[PDB]
Amino acid sequence: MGPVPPSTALRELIEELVNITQNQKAPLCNGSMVWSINLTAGMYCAALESLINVSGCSAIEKTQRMLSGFCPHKVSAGQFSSLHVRDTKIEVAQFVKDLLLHLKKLFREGRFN
């Protein structure tokens, strides 16, 4: 009835992200690239604004919603927070995988958000 706990939401997110990335043949997006970010705490928020730059990819539309659950502040294609540094862009396939390592990482510390 009430929302799912933080630890449960994370596992459901990791299991879903892995599932769509294991049977994926070619890149989910047309080789779209995203800005690299620093994986620390506000990863969900920093990661969200980076995905907001990817359009035309429904396979990740649901992902943006689940990420928002950990980041209540919405981001428009005009408002940016972590894209202040001039980092290089990377393929989404790598962005999802790099994020996967950090997602299960916080599970070990049980420190969600």
PDB file of N, CA and C in Angstrom:
ATOM      1  N   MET A   1       0.865  -1.213   0.000  1.00  0.00           N
ATOM      2  CA  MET A   1       0.000   0.000   0.000  1.00  0.00           C
ATOM      3  C   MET A   1       0.887   1.243   0.000  1.00  0.00           C
ATOM      4  N   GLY A   2       1.624   1.454   1.055  1.00  0.00           N
ATOM      5  CA  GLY A   2       2.519   2.641   1.112  1.00  0.00           C
ATOM      6  C   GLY A   2       3.684   2.430   0.142  1.00  0.00           C
ATOM      7  N   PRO A   3       4.486   3.440  -0.076  1.00  0.00           N
ATOM      8  CA  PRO A   3       5.642   3.318  -1.003  1.00  0.00           C
ATOM      9  C   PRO A   3       6.561   2.155  -0.618  1.00  0.00           C
ATOM     10  N   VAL A   4       7.360   1.679  -1.532  1.00  0.00           N
ATOM     11  CA  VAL A   4       8.266   0.548  -1.197  1.00  0.00           C
ATOM     12  C   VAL A   4       9.487   1.104  -0.423  1.00  0.00           C
ATOM     13  N   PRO A   5      10.075   0.362   0.508  1.00  0.00           N
ATOM     14  CA  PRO A   5      11.249   0.893   1.266  1.00  0.00           C
ATOM     15  C   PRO A   5      12.418   1.303   0.349  1.00  0.00           C
ATOM     16  N   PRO A   6      13.361   2.088   0.841  1.00  0.00           N
ATOM     17  CA  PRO A   6      14.523   2.507   0.006  1.00  0.00           C
ATOM     18  C   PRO A   6      15.362   1.318  -0.469  1.00  0.00           C
ATOM     19  N   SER A   7      15.678   0.416   0.418  1.00  0.00           N
ATOM     20  CA  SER A   7      16.503  -0.758   0.021  1.00  0.00           C
ATOM     21  C   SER A   7      15.757  -1.585  -1.027  1.00  0.00           C
ATOM     22  N   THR A   8      14.473  -1.747  -0.875  1.00  0.00           N
ATOM     23  CA  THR A   8      13.704  -2.546  -1.875  1.00  0.00           C
ATOM     24  C   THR A   8      13.648  -1.798  -3.206  1.00  0.00           C
ATOM     25  N   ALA A   9      13.431  -0.515  -3.169  1.00  0.00           N
ATOM     26  CA  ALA A   9      13.366   0.262  -4.434  1.00  0.00           C
ATOM     27  C   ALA A   9      14.696   0.135  -5.172  1.00  0.00           C
ATOM     28  N   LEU A  10      15.786   0.192  -4.459  1.00  0.00           N
ATOM     29  CA  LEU A  10      17.108   0.091  -5.130  1.00  0.00           C
ATOM     30  C   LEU A  10      17.270  -1.277  -5.806  1.00  0.00           C
ATOM     31  N   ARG A  11      17.009  -2.346  -5.099  1.00  0.00           N
ATOM     32  CA  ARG A  11      17.173  -3.700  -5.711  1.00  0.00           C
ATOM     33  C   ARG A  11      16.259  -3.814  -6.922  1.00  0.00           C
ATOM     34  N   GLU A  12      15.043  -3.369  -6.791  1.00  0.00           N
ATOM     35  CA  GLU A  12      14.110  -3.440  -7.940  1.00  0.00           C
ATOM     36  C   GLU A  12      14.707  -2.628  -9.087  1.00  0.00           C
ATOM     37  N   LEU A  13      15.334  -1.525  -8.779  1.00  0.00           N
ATOM     38  CA  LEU A  13      15.952  -0.699  -9.853  1.00  0.00           C
ATOM     39  C   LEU A  13      17.167  -1.443 -10.434  1.00  0.00           C
ATOM     40  N   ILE A  14      18.040  -1.958  -9.597  1.00  0.00           N
ATOM     41  CA  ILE A  14      19.236  -2.686 -10.130  1.00  0.00           C
ATOM     42  C   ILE A  14      18.772  -3.883 -10.965  1.00  0.00           C
ATOM     43  N   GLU A  15      17.873  -4.674 -10.460  1.00  0.00           N
ATOM     44  CA  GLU A  15      17.438  -5.863 -11.238  1.00  0.00           C
ATOM     45  C   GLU A  15      16.845  -5.410 -12.569  1.00  0.00           C
ATOM     46  N   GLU A  16      16.090  -4.349 -12.570  1.00  0.00           N
ATOM     47  CA  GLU A  16      15.494  -3.886 -13.849  1.00  0.00           C
ATOM     48  C   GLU A  16      16.579  -3.320 -14.770  1.00  0.00           C
ATOM     49  N   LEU A  17      17.475  -2.506 -14.261  1.00  0.00           N
ATOM     50  CA  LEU A  17      18.542  -1.935 -15.144  1.00  0.00           C
ATOM     51  C   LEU A  17      19.378  -3.059 -15.754  1.00  0.00           C
ATOM     52  N   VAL A  18      19.777  -4.007 -14.958  1.00  0.00           N
ATOM     53  CA  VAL A  18      20.602  -5.123 -15.490  1.00  0.00           C
ATOM     54  C   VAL A  18      19.811  -5.866 -16.572  1.00  0.00           C
ATOM     55  N   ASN A  19      18.596  -6.225 -16.278  1.00  0.00           N
ATOM     56  CA  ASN A  19      17.764  -6.979 -17.261  1.00  0.00           C
ATOM     57  C   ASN A  19      17.749  -6.287 -18.631  1.00  0.00           C
ATOM     58  N   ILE A  20      17.512  -5.004 -18.675  1.00  0.00           N
ATOM     59  CA  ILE A  20      17.453  -4.309 -19.996  1.00  0.00           C
ATOM     60  C   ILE A  20      18.853  -4.112 -20.594  1.00  0.00           C
ATOM     61  N   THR A  21      19.898  -4.305 -19.820  1.00  0.00           N
ATOM     62  CA  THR A  21      21.283  -4.109 -20.364  1.00  0.00           C
ATOM     63  C   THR A  21      21.943  -5.458 -20.687  1.00  0.00           C
ATOM     64  N   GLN A  22      21.394  -6.557 -20.235  1.00  0.00           N
ATOM     65  CA  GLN A  22      22.033  -7.874 -20.548  1.00  0.00           C
ATOM     66  C   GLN A  22      21.556  -8.395 -21.904  1.00  0.00           C
ATOM     67  N   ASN A  23      20.297  -8.230 -22.217  1.00  0.00           N
ATOM     68  CA  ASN A  23      19.783  -8.749 -23.519  1.00  0.00           C
ATOM     69  C   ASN A  23      19.821  -7.643 -24.571  1.00  0.00           C
ATOM     70  N   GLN A  24      20.468  -6.544 -24.291  1.00  0.00           N
ATOM     71  CA  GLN A  24      20.518  -5.461 -25.309  1.00  0.00           C
ATOM     72  C   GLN A  24      21.618  -5.790 -26.314  1.00  0.00           C
ATOM     73  N   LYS A  25      21.306  -5.771 -27.576  1.00  0.00           N
ATOM     74  CA  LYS A  25      22.345  -6.070 -28.598  1.00  0.00           C
ATOM     75  C   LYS A  25      23.049  -4.763 -28.954  1.00  0.00           C
ATOM     76  N   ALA A  26      22.441  -3.974 -29.790  1.00  0.00           N
ATOM     77  CA  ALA A  26      23.045  -2.669 -30.168  1.00  0.00           C
ATOM     78  C   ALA A  26      22.750  -1.666 -29.044  1.00  0.00           C
ATOM     79  N   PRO A  27      23.342  -0.494 -29.060  1.00  0.00           N
ATOM     80  CA  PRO A  27      23.077   0.494 -27.980  1.00  0.00           C
ATOM     81  C   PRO A  27      21.586   0.822 -27.864  1.00  0.00           C
ATOM     82  N   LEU A  28      21.119   1.110 -26.680  1.00  0.00           N
ATOM     83  CA  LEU A  28      19.672   1.428 -26.514  1.00  0.00           C
ATOM     84  C   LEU A  28      19.332   2.650 -27.365  1.00  0.00           C
ATOM     85  N   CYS A  29      20.087   3.701 -27.219  1.00  0.00           N
ATOM     86  CA  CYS A  29      19.831   4.926 -28.025  1.00  0.00           C
ATOM     87  C   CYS A  29      20.624   4.833 -29.327  1.00  0.00           C
ATOM     88  N   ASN A  30      20.359   5.699 -30.265  1.00  0.00           N
ATOM     89  CA  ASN A  30      21.115   5.647 -31.547  1.00  0.00           C
ATOM     90  C   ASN A  30      22.563   6.061 -31.289  1.00  0.00           C
ATOM     91  N   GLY A  31      23.221   5.414 -30.369  1.00  0.00           N
ATOM     92  CA  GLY A  31      24.633   5.780 -30.072  1.00  0.00           C
ATOM     93  C   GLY A  31      24.663   7.140 -29.377  1.00  0.00           C
ATOM     94  N   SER A  32      23.585   7.517 -28.743  1.00  0.00           N
ATOM     95  CA  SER A  32      23.561   8.829 -28.046  1.00  0.00           C
ATOM     96  C   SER A  32      24.625   8.826 -26.953  1.00  0.00           C
ATOM     97  N   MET A  33      25.169   9.974 -26.654  1.00  0.00           N
ATOM     98  CA  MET A  33      26.222  10.071 -25.605  1.00  0.00           C
ATOM     99  C   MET A  33      25.719  10.982 -24.487  1.00  0.00           C
ATOM    100  N   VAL A  34      26.239  10.818 -23.296  1.00  0.00           N
ATOM    101  CA  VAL A  34      25.809  11.672 -22.148  1.00  0.00           C
ATOM    102  C   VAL A  34      27.042  12.236 -21.452  1.00  0.00           C
ATOM    103  N   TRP A  35      26.870  13.287 -20.710  1.00  0.00           N
ATOM    104  CA  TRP A  35      28.024  13.905 -20.010  1.00  0.00           C
ATOM    105  C   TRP A  35      28.446  13.042 -18.823  1.00  0.00           C
ATOM    106  N   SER A  36      29.721  12.819 -18.663  1.00  0.00           N
ATOM    107  CA  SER A  36      30.189  12.001 -17.510  1.00  0.00           C
ATOM    108  C   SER A  36      29.983  12.807 -16.226  1.00  0.00           C
ATOM    109  N   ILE A  37      29.755  12.138 -15.124  1.00  0.00           N
ATOM    110  CA  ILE A  37      29.537  12.852 -13.825  1.00  0.00           C
ATOM    111  C   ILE A  37      30.367  12.190 -12.726  1.00  0.00           C
ATOM    112  N   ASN A  38      30.424  12.797 -11.573  1.00  0.00           N
ATOM    113  CA  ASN A  38      31.196  12.194 -10.454  1.00  0.00           C
ATOM    114  C   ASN A  38      30.261  11.302  -9.639  1.00  0.00           C
ATOM    115  N   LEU A  39      30.573  10.042  -9.525  1.00  0.00           N
ATOM    116  CA  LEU A  39      29.685   9.134  -8.753  1.00  0.00           C
ATOM    117  C   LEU A  39      29.983   9.288  -7.259  1.00  0.00           C
ATOM    118  N   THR A  40      29.113   9.952  -6.537  1.00  0.00           N
ATOM    119  CA  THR A  40      29.330  10.148  -5.074  1.00  0.00           C
ATOM    120  C   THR A  40      28.006   9.950  -4.326  1.00  0.00           C
ATOM    121  N   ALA A  41      27.342  11.026  -3.969  1.00  0.00           N
ATOM    122  CA  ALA A  41      26.043  10.917  -3.228  1.00  0.00           C
ATOM    123  C   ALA A  41      24.883  11.344  -4.130  1.00  0.00           C
ATOM    124  N   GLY A  42      24.846  12.590  -4.522  1.00  0.00           N
ATOM    125  CA  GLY A  42      23.734  13.068  -5.399  1.00  0.00           C
ATOM    126  C   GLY A  42      23.841  12.414  -6.779  1.00  0.00           C
ATOM    127  N   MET A  43      24.208  11.163  -6.832  1.00  0.00           N
ATOM    128  CA  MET A  43      24.338  10.478  -8.144  1.00  0.00           C
ATOM    129  C   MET A  43      22.991  10.472  -8.859  1.00  0.00           C
ATOM    130  N   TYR A  44      21.942  10.144  -8.156  1.00  0.00           N
ATOM    131  CA  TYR A  44      20.594  10.093  -8.793  1.00  0.00           C
ATOM    132  C   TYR A  44      20.264  11.447  -9.418  1.00  0.00           C
ATOM    133  N   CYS A  45      20.473  12.510  -8.698  1.00  0.00           N
ATOM    134  CA  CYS A  45      20.164  13.853  -9.255  1.00  0.00           C
ATOM    135  C   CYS A  45      21.143  14.185 -10.378  1.00  0.00           C
ATOM    136  N   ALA A  46      22.416  14.052 -10.135  1.00  0.00           N
ATOM    137  CA  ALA A  46      23.396  14.360 -11.208  1.00  0.00           C
ATOM    138  C   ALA A  46      23.124  13.442 -12.398  1.00  0.00           C
ATOM    139  N   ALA A  47      22.877  12.190 -12.135  1.00  0.00           N
ATOM    140  CA  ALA A  47      22.598  11.241 -13.244  1.00  0.00           C
ATOM    141  C   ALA A  47      21.311  11.643 -13.959  1.00  0.00           C
ATOM    142  N   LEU A  48      20.327  12.077 -13.226  1.00  0.00           N
ATOM    143  CA  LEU A  48      19.040  12.448 -13.869  1.00  0.00           C
ATOM    144  C   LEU A  48      19.246  13.581 -14.876  1.00  0.00           C
ATOM    145  N   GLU A  49      19.825  14.676 -14.469  1.00  0.00           N
ATOM    146  CA  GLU A  49      20.012  15.803 -15.427  1.00  0.00           C
ATOM    147  C   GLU A  49      20.786  15.323 -16.649  1.00  0.00           C
ATOM    148  N   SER A  50      21.698  14.413 -16.478  1.00  0.00           N
ATOM    149  CA  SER A  50      22.467  13.926 -17.653  1.00  0.00           C
ATOM    150  C   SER A  50      21.525  13.172 -18.604  1.00  0.00           C
ATOM    151  N   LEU A  51      20.632  12.382 -18.067  1.00  0.00           N
ATOM    152  CA  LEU A  51      19.684  11.614 -18.931  1.00  0.00           C
ATOM    153  C   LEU A  51      18.686  12.574 -19.583  1.00  0.00           C
ATOM    154  N   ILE A  52      18.323  13.617 -18.890  1.00  0.00           N
ATOM    155  CA  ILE A  52      17.356  14.597 -19.459  1.00  0.00           C
ATOM    156  C   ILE A  52      17.889  15.097 -20.810  1.00  0.00           C
ATOM    157  N   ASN A  53      19.151  14.898 -21.078  1.00  0.00           N
ATOM    158  CA  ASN A  53      19.710  15.352 -22.385  1.00  0.00           C
ATOM    159  C   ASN A  53      19.435  14.289 -23.456  1.00  0.00           C
ATOM    160  N   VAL A  54      19.102  13.092 -23.050  1.00  0.00           N
ATOM    161  CA  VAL A  54      18.816  12.015 -24.046  1.00  0.00           C
ATOM    162  C   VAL A  54      17.322  12.017 -24.373  1.00  0.00           C
ATOM    163  N   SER A  55      16.979  12.180 -25.627  1.00  0.00           N
ATOM    164  CA  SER A  55      15.540  12.200 -26.034  1.00  0.00           C
ATOM    165  C   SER A  55      15.311  11.205 -27.174  1.00  0.00           C
ATOM    166  N   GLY A  56      14.166  10.574 -27.198  1.00  0.00           N
ATOM    167  CA  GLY A  56      13.868   9.591 -28.280  1.00  0.00           C
ATOM    168  C   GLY A  56      14.153   8.171 -27.787  1.00  0.00           C
ATOM    169  N   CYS A  57      14.564   8.032 -26.549  1.00  0.00           N
ATOM    170  CA  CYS A  57      14.864   6.678 -25.987  1.00  0.00           C
ATOM    171  C   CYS A  57      13.814   6.309 -24.934  1.00  0.00           C
ATOM    172  N   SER A  58      12.794   5.594 -25.321  1.00  0.00           N
ATOM    173  CA  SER A  58      11.746   5.196 -24.336  1.00  0.00           C
ATOM    174  C   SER A  58      12.295   4.098 -23.421  1.00  0.00           C
ATOM    175  N   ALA A  59      13.188   3.291 -23.922  1.00  0.00           N
ATOM    176  CA  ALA A  59      13.749   2.189 -23.091  1.00  0.00           C
ATOM    177  C   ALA A  59      14.264   2.740 -21.757  1.00  0.00           C
ATOM    178  N   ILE A  60      14.617   4.006 -21.712  1.00  0.00           N
ATOM    179  CA  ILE A  60      15.135   4.614 -20.441  1.00  0.00           C
ATOM    180  C   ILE A  60      14.108   5.591 -19.854  1.00  0.00           C
ATOM    181  N   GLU A  61      12.982   5.769 -20.490  1.00  0.00           N
ATOM    182  CA  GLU A  61      11.971   6.720 -19.935  1.00  0.00           C
ATOM    183  C   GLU A  61      11.606   6.294 -18.515  1.00  0.00           C
ATOM    184  N   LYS A  62      11.294   5.044 -18.334  1.00  0.00           N
ATOM    185  CA  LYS A  62      10.936   4.544 -16.980  1.00  0.00           C
ATOM    186  C   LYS A  62      12.116   4.767 -16.032  1.00  0.00           C
ATOM    187  N   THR A  63      13.315   4.569 -16.511  1.00  0.00           N
ATOM    188  CA  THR A  63      14.513   4.758 -15.643  1.00  0.00           C
ATOM    189  C   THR A  63      14.516   6.184 -15.098  1.00  0.00           C
ATOM    190  N   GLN A  64      14.212   7.149 -15.912  1.00  0.00           N
ATOM    191  CA  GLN A  64      14.221   8.547 -15.416  1.00  0.00           C
ATOM    192  C   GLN A  64      13.216   8.673 -14.272  1.00  0.00           C
ATOM    193  N   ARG A  65      12.082   8.041 -14.392  1.00  0.00           N
ATOM    194  CA  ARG A  65      11.072   8.118 -13.301  1.00  0.00           C
ATOM    195  C   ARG A  65      11.617   7.483 -12.018  1.00  0.00           C
ATOM    196  N   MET A  66      12.144   6.290 -12.099  1.00  0.00           N
ATOM    197  CA  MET A  66      12.664   5.633 -10.865  1.00  0.00           C
ATOM    198  C   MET A  66      13.783   6.486 -10.259  1.00  0.00           C
ATOM    199  N   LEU A  67      14.632   7.047 -11.077  1.00  0.00           N
ATOM    200  CA  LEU A  67      15.731   7.901 -10.538  1.00  0.00           C
ATOM    201  C   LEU A  67      15.120   9.096  -9.801  1.00  0.00           C
ATOM    202  N   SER A  68      14.071   9.662 -10.336  1.00  0.00           N
ATOM    203  CA  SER A  68      13.433  10.829  -9.664  1.00  0.00           C
ATOM    204  C   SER A  68      12.998  10.424  -8.255  1.00  0.00           C
ATOM    205  N   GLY A  69      12.533   9.217  -8.089  1.00  0.00           N
ATOM    206  CA  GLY A  69      12.100   8.769  -6.733  1.00  0.00           C
ATOM    207  C   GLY A  69      13.211   9.064  -5.720  1.00  0.00           C
ATOM    208  N   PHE A  70      14.444   9.037  -6.153  1.00  0.00           N
ATOM    209  CA  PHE A  70      15.577   9.321  -5.223  1.00  0.00           C
ATOM    210  C   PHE A  70      15.981  10.790  -5.354  1.00  0.00           C
ATOM    211  N   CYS A  71      15.387  11.483  -6.288  1.00  0.00           N
ATOM    212  CA  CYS A  71      15.732  12.916  -6.520  1.00  0.00           C
ATOM    213  C   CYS A  71      14.432  13.729  -6.713  1.00  0.00           C
ATOM    214  N   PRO A  72      13.814  14.211  -5.648  1.00  0.00           N
ATOM    215  CA  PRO A  72      12.529  14.969  -5.773  1.00  0.00           C
ATOM    216  C   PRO A  72      12.601  16.268  -6.597  1.00  0.00           C
ATOM    217  N   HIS A  73      13.769  16.800  -6.876  1.00  0.00           N
ATOM    218  CA  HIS A  73      13.822  18.066  -7.680  1.00  0.00           C
ATOM    219  C   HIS A  73      13.921  17.717  -9.166  1.00  0.00           C
ATOM    220  N   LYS A  74      12.946  18.139  -9.926  1.00  0.00           N
ATOM    221  CA  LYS A  74      12.916  17.833 -11.384  1.00  0.00           C
ATOM    222  C   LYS A  74      13.937  18.703 -12.117  1.00  0.00           C
ATOM    223  N   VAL A  75      14.363  18.275 -13.280  1.00  0.00           N
ATOM    224  CA  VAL A  75      15.362  19.062 -14.063  1.00  0.00           C
ATOM    225  C   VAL A  75      14.881  19.216 -15.512  1.00  0.00           C
ATOM    226  N   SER A  76      14.888  20.420 -16.025  1.00  0.00           N
ATOM    227  CA  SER A  76      14.438  20.641 -17.432  1.00  0.00           C
ATOM    228  C   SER A  76      15.653  20.665 -18.363  1.00  0.00           C
ATOM    229  N   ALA A  77      15.428  20.540 -19.641  1.00  0.00           N
ATOM    230  CA  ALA A  77      16.558  20.556 -20.612  1.00  0.00           C
ATOM    231  C   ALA A  77      17.241  21.924 -20.587  1.00  0.00           C
ATOM    232  N   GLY A  78      16.760  22.821 -19.763  1.00  0.00           N
ATOM    233  CA  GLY A  78      17.369  24.184 -19.670  1.00  0.00           C
ATOM    234  C   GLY A  78      18.063  24.341 -18.314  1.00  0.00           C
ATOM    235  N   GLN A  79      17.571  23.677 -17.303  1.00  0.00           N
ATOM    236  CA  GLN A  79      18.201  23.797 -15.957  1.00  0.00           C
ATOM    237  C   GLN A  79      19.225  22.682 -15.765  1.00  0.00           C
ATOM    238  N   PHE A  80      20.431  23.031 -15.406  1.00  0.00           N
ATOM    239  CA  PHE A  80      21.490  22.002 -15.193  1.00  0.00           C
ATOM    240  C   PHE A  80      22.189  22.232 -13.850  1.00  0.00           C
ATOM    241  N   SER A  81      22.682  21.177 -13.230  1.00  0.00           N
ATOM    242  CA  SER A  81      23.384  21.317 -11.910  1.00  0.00           C
ATOM    243  C   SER A  81      24.821  20.762 -11.971  1.00  0.00           C
ATOM    244  N   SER A  82      25.002  19.560 -12.468  1.00  0.00           N
ATOM    245  CA  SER A  82      26.375  18.951 -12.491  1.00  0.00           C
ATOM    246  C   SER A  82      27.090  19.167 -13.831  1.00  0.00           C
ATOM    247  N   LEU A  83      26.448  19.743 -14.802  1.00  0.00           N
ATOM    248  CA  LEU A  83      27.129  19.939 -16.117  1.00  0.00           C
ATOM    249  C   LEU A  83      27.932  21.240 -16.118  1.00  0.00           C
ATOM    250  N   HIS A  84      28.394  21.667 -14.975  1.00  0.00           N
ATOM    251  CA  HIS A  84      29.200  22.921 -14.920  1.00  0.00           C
ATOM    252  C   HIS A  84      30.639  22.617 -15.351  1.00  0.00           C
ATOM    253  N   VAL A  85      31.120  21.445 -15.038  1.00  0.00           N
ATOM    254  CA  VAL A  85      32.514  21.069 -15.422  1.00  0.00           C
ATOM    255  C   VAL A  85      32.545  20.679 -16.900  1.00  0.00           C
ATOM    256  N   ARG A  86      33.668  20.855 -17.544  1.00  0.00           N
ATOM    257  CA  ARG A  86      33.759  20.507 -18.989  1.00  0.00           C
ATOM    258  C   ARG A  86      34.273  19.074 -19.153  1.00  0.00           C
ATOM    259  N   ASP A  87      33.503  18.106 -18.742  1.00  0.00           N
ATOM    260  CA  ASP A  87      33.940  16.691 -18.893  1.00  0.00           C
ATOM    261  C   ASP A  87      33.626  16.222 -20.315  1.00  0.00           C
ATOM    262  N   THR A  88      34.098  15.066 -20.687  1.00  0.00           N
ATOM    263  CA  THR A  88      33.820  14.551 -22.058  1.00  0.00           C
ATOM    264  C   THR A  88      32.564  13.685 -22.020  1.00  0.00           C
ATOM    265  N   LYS A  89      31.890  13.565 -23.128  1.00  0.00           N
ATOM    266  CA  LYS A  89      30.652  12.742 -23.156  1.00  0.00           C
ATOM    267  C   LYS A  89      31.019  11.267 -23.354  1.00  0.00           C
ATOM    268  N   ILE A  90      30.193  10.373 -22.863  1.00  0.00           N
ATOM    269  CA  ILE A  90      30.465   8.909 -23.005  1.00  0.00           C
ATOM    270  C   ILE A  90      29.214   8.207 -23.550  1.00  0.00           C
ATOM    271  N   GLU A  91      29.370   7.038 -24.108  1.00  0.00           N
ATOM    272  CA  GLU A  91      28.191   6.310 -24.662  1.00  0.00           C
ATOM    273  C   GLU A  91      27.231   5.951 -23.525  1.00  0.00           C
ATOM    274  N   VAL A  92      25.945   6.010 -23.765  1.00  0.00           N
ATOM    275  CA  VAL A  92      24.983   5.682 -22.674  1.00  0.00           C
ATOM    276  C   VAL A  92      25.277   4.274 -22.148  1.00  0.00           C
ATOM    277  N   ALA A  93      25.556   3.349 -23.022  1.00  0.00           N
ATOM    278  CA  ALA A  93      25.849   1.962 -22.566  1.00  0.00           C
ATOM    279  C   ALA A  93      26.880   2.001 -21.431  1.00  0.00           C
ATOM    280  N   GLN A  94      27.882   2.832 -21.542  1.00  0.00           N
ATOM    281  CA  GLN A  94      28.904   2.913 -20.456  1.00  0.00           C
ATOM    282  C   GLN A  94      28.327   3.657 -19.258  1.00  0.00           C
ATOM    283  N   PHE A  95      27.537   4.653 -19.508  1.00  0.00           N
ATOM    284  CA  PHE A  95      26.943   5.428 -18.392  1.00  0.00           C
ATOM    285  C   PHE A  95      26.103   4.505 -17.514  1.00  0.00           C
ATOM    286  N   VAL A  96      25.266   3.708 -18.114  1.00  0.00           N
ATOM    287  CA  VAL A  96      24.415   2.786 -17.315  1.00  0.00           C
ATOM    288  C   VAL A  96      25.305   1.805 -16.553  1.00  0.00           C
ATOM    289  N   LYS A  97      26.235   1.192 -17.232  1.00  0.00           N
ATOM    290  CA  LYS A  97      27.127   0.213 -16.556  1.00  0.00           C
ATOM    291  C   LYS A  97      27.898   0.902 -15.431  1.00  0.00           C
ATOM    292  N   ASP A  98      28.507   2.025 -15.693  1.00  0.00           N
ATOM    293  CA  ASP A  98      29.275   2.706 -14.610  1.00  0.00           C
ATOM    294  C   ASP A  98      28.340   2.995 -13.442  1.00  0.00           C
ATOM    295  N   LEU A  99      27.145   3.411 -13.727  1.00  0.00           N
ATOM    296  CA  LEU A  99      26.179   3.694 -12.636  1.00  0.00           C
ATOM    297  C   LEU A  99      25.841   2.376 -11.910  1.00  0.00           C
ATOM    298  N   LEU A 100      25.688   1.294 -12.636  1.00  0.00           N
ATOM    299  CA  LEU A 100      25.350  -0.019 -11.987  1.00  0.00           C
ATOM    300  C   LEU A 100      26.345  -0.342 -10.866  1.00  0.00           C
ATOM    301  N   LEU A 101      27.620  -0.160 -11.085  1.00  0.00           N
ATOM    302  CA  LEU A 101      28.592  -0.485  -9.997  1.00  0.00           C
ATOM    303  C   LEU A 101      28.275   0.335  -8.747  1.00  0.00           C
ATOM    304  N   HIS A 102      28.012   1.601  -8.892  1.00  0.00           N
ATOM    305  CA  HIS A 102      27.707   2.430  -7.692  1.00  0.00           C
ATOM    306  C   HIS A 102      26.348   2.050  -7.095  1.00  0.00           C
ATOM    307  N   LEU A 103      25.380   1.704  -7.895  1.00  0.00           N
ATOM    308  CA  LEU A 103      24.047   1.365  -7.306  1.00  0.00           C
ATOM    309  C   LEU A 103      24.173   0.208  -6.309  1.00  0.00           C
ATOM    310  N   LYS A 104      24.692  -0.916  -6.722  1.00  0.00           N
ATOM    311  CA  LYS A 104      24.813  -2.055  -5.764  1.00  0.00           C
ATOM    312  C   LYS A 104      25.827  -1.710  -4.669  1.00  0.00           C
ATOM    313  N   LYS A 105      26.690  -0.767  -4.926  1.00  0.00           N
ATOM    314  CA  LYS A 105      27.717  -0.389  -3.912  1.00  0.00           C
ATOM    315  C   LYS A 105      27.050   0.147  -2.636  1.00  0.00           C
ATOM    316  N   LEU A 106      26.138   1.075  -2.763  1.00  0.00           N
ATOM    317  CA  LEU A 106      25.466   1.638  -1.551  1.00  0.00           C
ATOM    318  C   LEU A 106      24.657   0.545  -0.846  1.00  0.00           C
ATOM    319  N   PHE A 107      24.237  -0.465  -1.559  1.00  0.00           N
ATOM    320  CA  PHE A 107      23.436  -1.541  -0.907  1.00  0.00           C
ATOM    321  C   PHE A 107      24.265  -2.173   0.208  1.00  0.00           C
ATOM    322  N   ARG A 108      25.530  -2.364  -0.026  1.00  0.00           N
ATOM    323  CA  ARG A 108      26.395  -2.975   1.016  1.00  0.00           C
ATOM    324  C   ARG A 108      26.390  -2.102   2.273  1.00  0.00           C
ATOM    325  N   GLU A 109      26.405  -0.806   2.117  1.00  0.00           N
ATOM    326  CA  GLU A 109      26.419   0.080   3.316  1.00  0.00           C
ATOM    327  C   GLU A 109      24.986   0.322   3.803  1.00  0.00           C
ATOM    328  N   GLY A 110      24.006  -0.180   3.099  1.00  0.00           N
ATOM    329  CA  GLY A 110      22.599   0.024   3.531  1.00  0.00           C
ATOM    330  C   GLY A 110      22.312   1.520   3.644  1.00  0.00           C
ATOM    331  N   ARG A 111      23.227   2.348   3.206  1.00  0.00           N
ATOM    332  CA  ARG A 111      22.988   3.816   3.280  1.00  0.00           C
ATOM    333  C   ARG A 111      22.384   4.276   1.962  1.00  0.00           C
ATOM    334  N   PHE A 112      21.088   4.329   1.908  1.00  0.00           N
ATOM    335  CA  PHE A 112      20.403   4.752   0.665  1.00  0.00           C
ATOM    336  C   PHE A 112      20.225   6.270   0.686  1.00  0.00           C
ATOM    337  N   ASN A 113      20.587   6.933  -0.380  1.00  0.00           N
ATOM    338  CA  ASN A 113      20.463   8.423  -0.429  1.00  0.00           C
ATOM    339  C   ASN A 113      21.370   9.039   0.641  1.00  0.00           C
TER     340      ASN A 113
END
